[PDB]
Write a protein that binds this ligand. Structure first.
Ligand SMILES: [Cl-]
Ligand SMILES: [Cl-]
Ligand SMILES: [Cl-]
Ligand SMILES: [Cl-]
Lengths: 173, 173, 173, 173
């Protein structure tokens, strides 16, 4: 057991394990989003790429949390990972709305863990979240919001055409 | 005071100080235009970039006037800077129309100062405006006119789509 | 409006807009300080350069705040910018004392916004100030203090000579 | 005679010849200033260099006027060149005051020729002065004013010491 643990509450330890589960589930959701847009009957490569990149980012977030858990002397505990909430994700607009909802949920879990850390006077935990997660999340949510607005402007006009142009001229492919 | 001042009227000195104020207010207006197009619910990066670039150009114009004021032995006097005339700037078309109006106003102030300099037989002032401002202004107004025509052609067709395409295919991003 | 805003109080939003105004006014003050030292009857190039550099830094601070305001889903609102408090700034010593007073005022506004953010449990805001402003401000104020001491030591001795040597041998030109 | 002359008045032709004489006399004055500061009992190398550089600049100004005279089909006419007004030039401060007076005199002759050209509707002449002389003169006079202020600040304090420091730390050597 732990010869190193210092100022690391059982409450934070458990919440970090829950947050790892939430990041891995987000990664899984993004994997499903990504492969949906690779279907021959959907075929939006840029959209596929955008969500596959987010699957990787979320998995890396989970790995960084696990590394931190060990650095503090806590013990990683893994739970089952729930499948994503949908099997088909609709249009680019539907998908980007679902992604923003998911990110807001992750952001709220980060903020809740920051508050717990503040309450338990665990500055290392607070700084770790500040330095590696909170600003990344704000930037991502802003980028998703920007995308949502641009998609909305395009598919109001003419939906098929608008969806193609967004994929071609905004997303990387 | 001034050991160097020669052939530099009090009338020109004062008008140069007023023109500095007008350039700084134009810079401020462009700062507001730029950040409006960066809002998550507007999200036209190219448009944002175009106006941020103009904010910088106008500030540089003011600095060049101040440098000249000191080179001639006049004394810079700063006044309050009025906030921009709007808090929200509408569509790309609305914004480009407002920008052309602003530029025409600055161009008229340059022409009025050139006329004062001519009347006061101040060739250094006249040449300074000719060399650093009058042609820059004509070129900018032509570019804005070109943009306005292209935006008009696009948003007559289909407004959301047209605004996106102009931002993607004309403006630098 | 905002699809992205999360954990961002109206109180912080307003205070960020006020802080933008304070940074822009500081930039304006530094512009005036800089051009005063470029006058032919003052003629201290290093001093001019030092304050022009600070005008740029403060403007960049304002732009970073505006970027953050949009990233969080707040709305930039601009007010009139008050002219600087003086038209002439006296000696290098007078000017450096005025600059330290101004910086302390900006530092206090940063600390007050940090306290508001702490009270509203907005860790992103707190970290943003910590990461981009609070240490920059401490370093600048230390540098100004160092300068003030050196100027004082020089102009006690022999004021004209001392002011020239400080400009030549301390400030970059 | 002239197969090329067009729109070039006899009045301008004569005034250009007088201006050549004034530039050559200024060059001669600067030659004398320069060698005075090279005397073993004056020995301010930077000051010597500053005035020798101005002797060259003024000679080049005269050559450019002569080139222009031929380009327009006028005929260069040379007169005697009056010796400089002093044989010894006093201190750096005395010398810099004499130089500013001389430059103001040259600037006034340029402005008077510009006015003649304007009155005779000779835009080539007006532009030639604007492009090659008027801004050069304003910049030089500003630089001399800056120097005068710095010398004054130094030799008020302690004259010998101040004169040495200006030569060492401001002027190029
Ligand atoms: Cl499930
Ligand atoms: Cl107003
Ligand atoms: Cl005020
Ligand atoms: Cl004589």
């Amino acid at each position: 057991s732990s010869q190193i643990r210092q100022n690391y509450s059982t409450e934070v330890e458990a919440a970090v394990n829950r947050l790892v589960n939430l990041y891995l589930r987000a990664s899984y959701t993004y994997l499903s989003l990504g492969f949906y847009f690779d279907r021959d009957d959907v075929a939006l490569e840029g959209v596929c790429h955008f969500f596959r990149e987010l699957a990787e980012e979320k998995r890396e977030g989970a790995e960084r949390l696990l590394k931190m858990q060990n650095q503090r002397g806590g013990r990683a505990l893994f739970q089952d990972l729930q499948k994503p909430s949908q099997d088909e994700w609709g249009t680019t607009l539907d998908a980007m709305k679902a992604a923003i909802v998911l990110e807001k949920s992750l952001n709220q879990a980060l903020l809740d863990l920051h508050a717990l850390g503040s309450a338990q006077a665990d500055p290392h935990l607070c700084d770790f979240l500040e330095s590696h997660f909170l600003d990344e999340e704000v930037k991502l949510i802003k980028k998703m919001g920007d995308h949502l607005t641009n998609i909305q402007r395009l598919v109001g006009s003419q939906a098929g055409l608008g969806e193609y142009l967004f994929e071609r001229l905004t997303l990387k492919h």
